[PDB]
Motif scaffolding. Structure first.
Motif, short mmCIF file in Angstrom:
data_model
loop_
_atom_site.label_atom_id
_atom_site.label_comp_id
_atom_site.label_asym_id
_atom_site.label_seq_id
_atom_site.Cartn_x
_atom_site.Cartn_y
_atom_site.Cartn_z
N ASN A 48 17.40 5.13 13.14
CA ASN A 48 16.57 4.38 14.08
C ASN A 48 15.09 4.80 14.02
N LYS A 49 14.23 3.91 14.49
CA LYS A 49 12.80 4.15 14.62
C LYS A 49 12.35 3.43 15.89
N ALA A 50 11.60 4.13 16.72
CA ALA A 50 11.10 3.57 17.97
C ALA A 50 9.69 4.16 18.29
N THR A 51 9.05 3.72 19.39
CA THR A 51 7.71 4.10 19.79
C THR A 51 7.53 5.63 19.98
N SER A 52 8.43 6.31 20.70
CA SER A 52 8.28 7.77 20.83
C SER A 52 9.38 8.54 20.15
N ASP B 126 11.06 6.11 24.88
CA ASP B 126 11.67 5.24 23.87
C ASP B 126 12.01 6.04 22.61
N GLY B 127 13.08 6.83 22.67
CA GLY B 127 13.52 7.66 21.56
C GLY B 127 14.41 6.92 20.59
N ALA B 128 14.96 7.63 19.61
CA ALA B 128 15.79 7.00 18.59
C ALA B 128 17.24 7.49 18.53
N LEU B 129 17.48 8.71 19.02
CA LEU B 129 18.82 9.29 19.03
C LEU B 129 19.23 9.49 20.48
N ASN B 130 20.52 9.29 20.82
CA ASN B 130 21.06 9.41 22.19
C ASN B 130 20.24 8.54 23.15
N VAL B 131 20.08 7.27 22.76
CA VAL B 131 19.30 6.25 23.45
C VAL B 131 20.04 5.61 24.66
#
Ligand SMILES: Nc1nc2c(ncn2[C@@H]2O[C@H](COP(=O)(O)OP(=O)(O)OP(=O)(O)O)[C@@H](O)[C@H]2O)c(=O)[nH]1
Ligand SMILES: Nc1nc2c(ncn2[C@@H]2O[C@H](COP(=O)(O)OP(=O)(O)OP(=O)(O)O)[C@@H](O)[C@H]2O)c(=O)[nH]1
Ligand SMILES: Nc1nc2c(ncn2[C@@H]2O[C@H](COP(=O)(O)OP(=O)(O)O)[C@@H](O)[C@H]2O)c(=O)[nH]1
Ligand SMILES: Nc1nc2c(ncn2[C@@H]2O[C@H](COP(=O)(O)OP(=O)(O)O)[C@@H](O)[C@H]2O)c(=O)[nH]1
Ligand SMILES: [Mg+2]
Ligand SMILES: [Mg+2]
Lengths: 130, 430, 433, 428, 429
Positions: free
Chosen positions: A9-13, C240-245
């Motif tokens: 995944n890739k996101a803002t923070s 707004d993270g990427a792991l354990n969202v």
């Protein structure tokens, strides 16, 4: 050395990925009523043990009442026995004293009877002397 | 778990109870009028545990003072803090108990008990969250022993869910008031085993011996004995009176101290040992060492003669918490054979900044030791020596008692001894 | 939107809650009055609702059977942050007795707590579930929490429930019966919890003494450190993270079997604020520290076990290249043994938001930090230690009368202990081949 | 509250009553008219609306001569005429006349007056009965009164101050008969009896007070001091108080074993330096200071009550008792682990102006239950046996309605009492 | 126990009785008119025991004077203190009894007895608390012996609960009035054994011997004998007449002196022994020694010949009470064998400040000695010597008596002797 990176995944923070060093060797209802039933059974056991405690304490109060009553009954029996023993003694003593005085007066009455007989005997000699 | 209701019954009960109120009032910054004149918020944080707030900024002890004779009550009223007590809380008869447990429990005490219950009910009803009751009394006389145990049974009936705590003074021929003390004590122990949650065994034999041997008082008085009691009472109640984590209330203390319901008799320990006149050091290592010293016990038992089931240790004054923790660990490690292995981590420690009145540093030990059986054995031997010849028995049967009550009280106390011995011999491989 | 409702139970849960919410406010720029002068993330709404006055209010409930601890929240620095309705207290506590908390006292306040939870759930458009903070040792933390968990499974059937549980330690414990409470609550809670992060008070206590130079750590010292770890775990839900969202991802990534749901938490770096200006630790240094038992939240030896999953959660100035290089060297020098059926590897997440520290606290502000969450069979050592203390006392029935007096049957002790014996066996079976 | 009613029977009881009530008035500041210009004195004195303090006492005699001296004496206003009760003819040194013939004519009147005193009590502790063993009234009327008091008051405490006969001052050959008869009849009705041997008091007056030939005035003033010491614990509120119930509980191990030995110290001549607590306490274990002639070394102690008065502090009492506890010669029975009861009162011993006794700073009266007191019964029983073997003087009793079976029964009871003292002294 | 009623019967009875009233009146400060002119409150304290208070401040003896002949009563009226007596209390016949017991007891005495009872009833009925009666009489004549014992039996019938006390003069051939005195005495002793509570044996044999041997009176008169009797009577009644603790009344004296009902015959002793109006004092030791001296006994018996059952010792005059107590203890300790061991503390002592008239110091002994059997043996031997031959027996059978009365009276008196001997030989064993 053989490390496999897989992007996830890739996101803002954030940014995430997986790193695999070696693959695997081997590939591959409570109910409200039931809860209520248990809590009520526990409450009944608590209530039952408290009732047994109070029942035991009630039996102690009963004993306390029996011991006060026993002290009263012993005191009343002491009074009663003291009263009857004293009445026995005073009556027996009155009978004895009266008997002792009756015997003494009877002895004196016999003396009086004898004295009249002596005087009678004298009259058959006195005057009766021709 | 906020308010405690204090009751003191008979001569001894009112004498040690008055001394307790004097000590804790001084510690909390309360003067004989009930006014706070201290300089620490720690003093007032939990003051409502023992005091009610009355008209103005005054604090009134939640204390009920009881006796079957007016003499003791008058002496307390005229004593140093006598004016602090609520006048309506003095409940007293005129007849006396004639040093006779049967008179206190069944005849004279029975005639006064409802007047006492009315006062304790008034105090209890005004509590936001009543913890329970704390009774000070002796077991050797008639009022404190007989009427005190009658009160405990009546209070248990009305408040079966509250904690019943006692400071019970055990008789000794060393400082005796009456010949029938072993009878009065055995009959009272029978009641305590069944109706109290926690009982502090304050032994006059131990208090005399501390005064004679340690303090070198050739002829100790009740005042010398009561100085040790007031210090001990201050120490054992520290966690209830000041902010803290451990044993902060009567129920949490009982959960930590009482593994089996009948085994609730505590052996209090205190250091340093001082006289009233000795207002003259004691390091953290030295304070901790006194936990295993028979010379520091307020019950005439040797802690080395048995094993600790549970212990609460309270350190007071300015000292290093780290040093206290280190020494407490060292004492358990160095004395492994004197703690039951089947109750892990059975020693809990508390530290309070406020030292007891007149001291800079102190340590109080509340121990549940199987060595307490020595105290009960001593009473039992004195009891048997008299009961074997039925000496003085007519004074008890005359009150309506049966000889079977004596046999039963003795049997229960002998069972209590056997129970302590059973757990003393118990191993972690049951 | 993916809302999370936090539930704080007993003194430990409430005091840890204070530390967490203080930290969240600092991380999101929320003042103690709820105001936020607010680019931007917006993800903070998962933990904070908003009022008509523009105030940000925690989606939290504080519950205790006694009012003293929650009263400090009601009158403290953060009294405006919470609405009185979410701070719920009774009059009398559970007296360190599980039976008292679950069966006697807890029973009188459960419905009130569930009503307040329902009111928070009603304000959620996509409720994830619950984060429950409590101790294993207290009567409320053990007894009330297990009762609450049971009802939450009834009212929120699907919904995730994550725990942050305080494992007992003699250095700071307040009751001899804590082993009883711990086993009793674990037994009743086991099937109702999806994932539980145990924190051993002894491990935190030693980290404070060793890494922070605190002679005798207090609950304040322990809780500030715990809050850092909790914040690291929840960061990806609040930013707004990427792991354990989402909450379900914690179970997906860490829990292969329902019962074995106790991951081991490791955190680094823990550096003293009073340290004479230290050069910042690299990604390699903080990553190496993840595999050192001295930095674990629970005392156990992962060498005596096998890994089933490992999540590395990095925060701050961290780049993937440095993470991969660090992991590559660790694998070369160490045996990171995984079970046969799981792949040997790591799921890595980087949250760009910096590690935040409480001003005036004991922790030094750092440029980068990492929290590793690993499901290892080594954590069974913690159960073994607790079960042994339980067995020593229970063999004699010591203190059992306190529980029976509250209506609990003696048989519940044997049932709870048998369940923990099966759990110890499960950890052994899962680690087999 | 806590009232005690005193009953003075016969010449000995009345004359000792005169000495006691004179002393109480001096101790409490009560004038002979009843006026008084603590509060515990109300146990022995009631108050009238006019402020007069009146003894809770009844004086009874079957002849009027002795009580007539009270009626016309210094204290005639102290007592209401109703509490001074007399008949016309005495019991002529005959138990039978005191108990039956003469006594029965005045019992109802006496009981009525006692009931009137009891009606004025809110917490009646009990009765204190003063009488001789030897007189016809002191023996026979007292036994009849005690029996009637057990009927009207049940188990209410009844304590005695009894005068044990002595040849140096005795007035009748049959005193051993009267003593055994009254003891048998009274035994089950009395809770505690303090015997005073006239020979012991006589010898103390000769030795300690230098009186060549003591009179009843000399004996009674000394007796009055001992009685005051015993009752001071009820009439004042001191450091340690002992009520009637406490005397009973602490001194009487078995109902029949109820005769404590009284020892008093110091007895110093008004001619003739102050004796310490240790010295006066040590004097309590010297036979020369006893109220009954006997040797405690030939017996065992079962109980010891120490009643101090004057300048005494508990610390000094405990130190004195501790040294007494170490004395090998002072032997207690093996069934008595704790044998001491201490009472302390602040008022120093008051002495009658113009009396034989010197004013001291502190004094003590020990009440001890010793098996040695059985020596007194043995001496009396022997004199009884010598006469009874021949039936000497028995006709005087039989003539008045008694039966010889009462003599045998009374004597058998005293034989059982002597056996009881032997049994109680044995080791377990 | 206040008033005593005194009766004096016959010649001897009225002669010793008049002397008794003269002595005690002098001691109490009463003159022949009945007026008190003394100077001591001790004299009046118990005056009402023997005297009634009459018009003015006068004291009248509670005395009844009886005789079957007017002679002695006229002599009493004319004697010193003759005017003190109540005139209506003189009761007398004209016939006489001829020194015959049967005449006094059954015939002439029976005809006068109701007139006497009239007077004694009047005296007794006015008593606040009558102690009993005191009779003075001889046993050898007819009126005092026969009518006196008849009076005792009549008085006993009406007052069975009062004490009957007598001063009985025993006959002796040394100073005799008739040949039948042993008969009259035996018949009277038979009555006394059964109807009196206490009898003082005043023996004319002893009185004569004291006058002849000790006082060296070659030919004693009844006036010389009566001086010893009046002194003895003053001494023995001391405790009844003056304030004191011991034997203060007739019943308390009898309870202390009489262990067996029949053994109520006392041996009076007195010291010093003096003749009329003759001034000669003894020390306390000397006074105490006379208790065992036969020369000081008013009954002709030797106290060393038997044992004392009981003794009342009365010391009079100014002397040390301590010295009296010491000497009395010494006499019992030194003479242990002469006191029965089975009656402990059988010797009671009294001390009175007022000495008897004409003396400065004195001692009176009232003894209940088993040696008194010598007096009864002497009478019995004289009786037997006559009765064996039925000599003079018609003097009695002529009055209506039967010979069986003589056998009974003799038997009873012989039984009395055996009883005294039984207790003399009795041991404490
Ligand atoms: N880390 C940490 N542990 C705590 C804290 N407060 C208590 N504990 C631990 O929790 C256990 C005691 O449980 P508590 O939470 O205080 O008790 P409770 O839940 O309030 O339950 P009761 O008061 O017994 O009704 C012990 O192991 C304590 O050391 C805290 O703030 N931080
Ligand atoms: N201590 C003392 N003993 C006395 C006194 N008066 C009499 N006694 C003794 O008591 C005994 C005689 O009994 P009393 O009391 O005089 O006689 P009573 O009770 O009046 O009986 P009666 O007069 O016989 O009806 C003798 O042992 C006397 O020594 C006295 O005032 N003091
Ligand atoms: N420690 C101590 N013991 C006391 C005190 N007063 C009495 N005692 C003891 O209490 C017992 C007598 O009981 P007490 O309380 O006086 O009788 P009560 O009034 O009937 O309760 C004996 O063991 C005494 O030694 C006191 O002030 N301190
Ligand atoms: N002692 C004494 N004996 C007398 C006197 N008169 C007579 N007797 C004796 O009394 C006896 C004669 O009795 P008496 O009294 O004269 O006769 P009665 O008139 O019939 O009583 C003889 O023993 C006389 O010796 C007297 O005055 N004194
Ligand atoms: Mg709590
Ligand atoms: Mg008298």
């Amino acid at each position: 050395a053989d490390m496999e990176v897989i992007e996830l995944n890739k996101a803002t923070s954030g940014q995430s990925w997986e790193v695999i060093l070696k693959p695997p060797s081997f590939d591959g209802d409570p109910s409200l009523e039931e809860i209520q039933k248990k809590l009520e059974a526990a409450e009944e056991r608590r209530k039952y043990q408290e009732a047994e405690l109070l029942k035991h304490l009630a039996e102690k109060r009963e004993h306390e009442r029996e011991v006060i009553q026993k002290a009263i009954e012993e005191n009343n029996n002491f009074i009663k026995m003291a009263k009857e023993k004293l009445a026995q003694k005073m009556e027996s003593n009155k009978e004895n004293r009266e008997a002792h005085l009756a015997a003494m007066l009877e002895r004196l009455q016999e003396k009086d009877k004898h004295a009249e007989e002596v005087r009678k005997n004298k009259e058959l000699k006195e005057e009766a002397s021709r | 778990m906020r308010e405690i209701v204090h009751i003191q019954a008979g001569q001894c009960g009112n004498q040690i109870g008055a001394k307790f109120w004097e000590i804790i009032s001084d510690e909390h910054g309360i003067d004989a009028t009930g006014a706070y004149h201290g300089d620490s918020d720690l003093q007032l944080e939990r003051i409502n545990v023992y005091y009610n707030e009355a008209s103005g900024g005054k604090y009134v002890p939640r204390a009920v003072l009881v006796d079957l004779e007016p003499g003791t009550m008058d002496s307390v009223r005229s004593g140093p803090f006598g004016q602090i007590f609520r006048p309506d809380n003095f409940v007293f008869g005129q007849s006396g108990a004639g040093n006779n447990w049967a008179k206190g429990h069944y005849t004279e005490g029975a005639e006064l008990v409802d007047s006492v219950l009315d006062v304790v009910r008034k105090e209890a009803e005004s509590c936001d969250c009543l913890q329970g009751f704390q009774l000070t009394h002796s077991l050797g006389g008639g009022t404190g022993s007989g009427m005190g145990t009658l009160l405990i049974s009546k209070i248990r009936e009305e408040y079966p869910d509250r904690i019943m705590n006692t400071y019970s003074v055990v008789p000794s021929p060393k400082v005796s008031d009456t010949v029938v003390e072993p009878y009065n004590a055995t009959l009272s122990v029978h009641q305590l085993v069944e109706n109290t949650d926690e009982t502090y065994c304050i032994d006059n034999e131990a208090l005399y011996d501390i005064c004679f041997r340690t303090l070198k008082l050739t002829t100790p008085t009740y005042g010398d004995l009561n100085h040790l009691v007031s210090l001990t009472m201050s120490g054992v109640t520290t966690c209830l009176r000041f902010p803290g984590q451990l044993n902060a209330d009567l129920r949490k203390l009982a959960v930590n101290m009482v593994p089996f319901p009948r085994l609730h008799f505590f052996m209090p320990g205190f250091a340093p040992l001082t006289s009233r006149g000795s207002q003259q050091a004691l390091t953290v290592p030295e304070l901790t060492q006194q936990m295993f010293d028979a010379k520091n016990m307020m019950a005439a038992c040797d802690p080395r003669h048995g094993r600790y089931l549970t212990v609460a240790a309270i350190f007071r004054g300015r000292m290093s918490m780290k040093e206290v923790d280190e020494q407490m660990l060292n004492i358990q490690n160095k004395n492994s054979s004197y703690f039951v292995e089947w109750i892990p981590n059975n020693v809990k420690t508390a530290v309070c900044d406020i030292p007891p009145r007149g001291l800079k540093m102190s340590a109080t030990f509340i121990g549940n030791s199987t060595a307490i059986q020595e105290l009960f054995k001593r009473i039992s031997e004195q009891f048997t020596a008299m009961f074997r010849r039925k000496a003085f028995l007519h004074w008890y049967t005359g009150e309506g008692m049966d000889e079977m009550e004596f046999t039963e009280a003795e049997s229960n106390m002998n069972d209590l001894v056997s129970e302590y011995q059973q757990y003393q011999e118990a191993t972690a491989d049951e | 939107m993916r809302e999370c409702i936090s539930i704080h139970v007993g003194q430990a849960g409430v005091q840890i809650g204070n530390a967490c919410w203080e930290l969240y406010c600092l991380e999101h720029g929320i003042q103690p009055d709820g105001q936020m002068p607010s680019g931007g993330d917006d993800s903070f709404n998962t933990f904070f609702s908003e009022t008509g006055a523009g105030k940000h209010v925690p989606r939290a409930v504080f519950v205790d059977l006694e009012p003293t601890v929650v009263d400090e929240v009601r009158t403290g620095t953060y009294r405006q942050l919470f609405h009185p309705e979410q701070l719920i207290t009774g009059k009398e506590d559970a007296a360190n007795n599980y039976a008292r908390g679950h069966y006697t006292i807890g029973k009188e306040i459960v419905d009130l707590v569930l009503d307040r939870i329902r009111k928070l759930a009603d304000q959620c458009t996509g409720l994830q579930g619950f984060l429950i903070f409590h101790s294993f040792g207290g009567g409320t933390g053990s007894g009330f929490t297990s009762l609450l968990m049971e009802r939450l499974s009834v009212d929120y059937g699907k919904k995730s429930k994550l725990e942050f549980a305080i494992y007992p330690a003699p250095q700071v414990s307040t009751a001899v019966v804590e082993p009883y409470n711990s086993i009793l609550t674990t037994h009743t809670t086991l099937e109702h919890s999806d994932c539980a992060f145990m924190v051993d008070n002894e491990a935190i206590y030693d980290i404070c003494r060793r890494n922070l130079d605190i002679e005798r750590p207090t609950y304040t010292n322990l809780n500030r450190l715990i809050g850092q770890i909790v914040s690291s775990i929840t960061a990806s839900l609040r930013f707004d993270g990427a792991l354990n969202v989402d909450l379900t991802e914690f179970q997906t990534n860490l829990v292969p079997y329902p019962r074995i749901h106790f991951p081991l938490v490791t955190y680094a770096p823990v550096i003293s604020a009073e340290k004479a200006y230290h050069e910042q630790l690299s990604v390699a240094e903080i990553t190496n520290a993840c595999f050192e038992p001295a930095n674990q939240m629970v005392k156990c030896d992962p060498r005596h076990g096998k890994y089933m999953a490992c999540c590395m959660l990095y925060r701050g100035d961290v780049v993937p290249k440095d993470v991969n290089a660090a992991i590559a060297t660790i694998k070369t020098k160490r045996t990171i043994q995984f079970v046969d059926w799981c792949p040997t590897g790591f799921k890595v997440g980087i949250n760009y938001q910096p590690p935040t520290v409480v001003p005036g606290g004991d922790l030094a502000k750092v440029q980068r930090a990492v929290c590793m969450l690993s499901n290892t069979t080594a954590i069974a050592e913690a159960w073994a230690r607790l079960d042994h203390k339980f067995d020593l006392m229970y063999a004699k029935r010591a203190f059992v009368h306190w529980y029976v007096g509250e209506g609990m049957e003696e048989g519940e002790f044997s049932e709870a202990r048998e369940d923990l014996a099966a759990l110890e066996k499960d950890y052994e079976e899962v680690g087999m081949d």
